[PDB]
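queue> pop job 88
queue> type: inverse folding (structure -> sequence)
queue> payload:
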């Protein structure tokens, strides 16, 4: 099946998922000199005080910190969004080197990693139905640069030893995702897609302008995970990012001047 290697990577995905060459694919390069400030965009509303994390899973492509999305406990609203979107999970995409790893780029700059907090539109009832709609998901993307450690990320880094391989999961309760946010909520937004198969064009992307900083030791631990399952040849989980796709007929809007 699909992956990130030379024979099953992003350049091959279109054979099984033709929408890979679609009109609103993600990620994209964010050209800061052409994004337009939109004074009508509202401040984002991130309400994570009642967030309930449950588990962390290595799914063979990344690791997902899953939340209870059976109630409106952790929701995203406002910004370019109409309605309420519930947090279902967050994960990261990262590189083999600090100079690459993010999916979105800013003026062609690649960050060491990118965090995606995935939310689905409650008007569709469940994640599976939401991904079949143009406004089904809202993903909050946050860039990671290497420098000072991010205290709020350490609990995630420390549990990785227990989910080293594909299919492994571990209890991960009481994790506060607010500890992964930068100070500012200024953002860019554009209509896009899932960045891994099925690549459905169901995402309102909201990418924060301010990166968070993580330490080299923290990212190094992400690179010790495995794409493979236990007992299989070790293939380090690194460079699990899709490169920038054609913007085509889309405009990226900025919430700030
Ligand atoms: O990478 C992303 O932020 C968005 N996602 C995807 O691209 C994707 C693909 C398959 C299943 C689930 C997901 S997702 O919602 O996590
Ligand atoms: Zn992602």
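queue> result:
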């Amino acid at each position: 099946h699909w992956g990130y290697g030379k024979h099953n990577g992003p350049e091959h995905w279109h054979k099984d998922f033709p929408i890979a060459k679609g009109e609103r694919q993600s990620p994209v390069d964010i050209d800061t000199h052409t994004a337009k400030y939109d004074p009508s965009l509202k401040p984002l509303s991130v309400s994570y005080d009642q967030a309930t994390s449950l588990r962390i899973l290595n799914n063979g492509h990344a690791f997902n910190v899953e939340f209870d999305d059976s109630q409106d406990k952790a929701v995203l609203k406002g910004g370019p969004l109409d309605g309420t979107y519930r947090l279902i999970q967050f994960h990261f995409h990262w590189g083999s080197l600090d100079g690459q790893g993010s999916e979105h780029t800013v003026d062609k700059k690649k960050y060491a990693a990118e965090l995606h907090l995935v939310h689905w539109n409650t008007k569709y009832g469940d994640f599976g139905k939401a991904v079949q709609q143009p406004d089904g998901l809202a993903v909050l993307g946050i860039f990671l640069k290497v420098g000072s450690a991010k205290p709020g990320l350490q609990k995630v880094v420390d549990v990785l030893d227990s989910i080293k391989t594909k299919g492994k999961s571990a209890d991960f309760t009481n994790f506060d995702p607010r500890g992964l946010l930068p100070e500012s909520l200024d953002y860019w937004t554009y209509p896009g897609s899932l960045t891994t198969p099925p690549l459905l064009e169901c995402v309102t992307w909201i990418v924060l302008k301010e990166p968070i900083s993580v330490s080299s030791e923290q990212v190094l631990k992400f690179r010790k995970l495995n794409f493979n399952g236990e007992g299989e040849p070790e293939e380090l989980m690194v460079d699990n990012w899709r490169p920038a796709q054609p913007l085509k007929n889309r405009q990226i809007k900025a919430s700030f001047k």
